[PDB]
Structures are given as structure tokens and as C-alpha cells.
């Protein structure tokens, strides 16, 4: 059992506990989409 955080979620660049797939930017400091 895990929460995590959807997008444009609050979060931190080092305690970045965003959804997989995502990426969390120091910018904004929050989550966003991201595919390599």
C-alpha cells in the first residue's frame, strides 16, 4: 500500500515522492509528465 502524488502535485527536488513516470522540477517545484 503507497500514496503517491498525481501532477502539478507540491513537492520537493530531493524528497520528490511524485507517481512514476513523472518528473518533480525545482522550477515549479511540483510534478510533471515526462517520457524519454
Known amino acids: 500500500s503507497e ?3 498525481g501532477a ?3 513537492c520537493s527536488p530531493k524528497n520528490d ?3 512514476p513516470n ?3 522540477s ?3 517545484l511540483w ?3 515526462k517520457i524519454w
Do not use: E, P
Open 22 to 24: 513523472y518528473k518533480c
Open 31 to 33: 510534478c510533471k509528465y
Open 17 to 19: 515522492k511524485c507517481c
Open 3 to 5: 500514496d503517491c502524488l
Open 8 to 10: 502539478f502535485s507540491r
Open 26 to 28: 525545482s522550477k515549479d
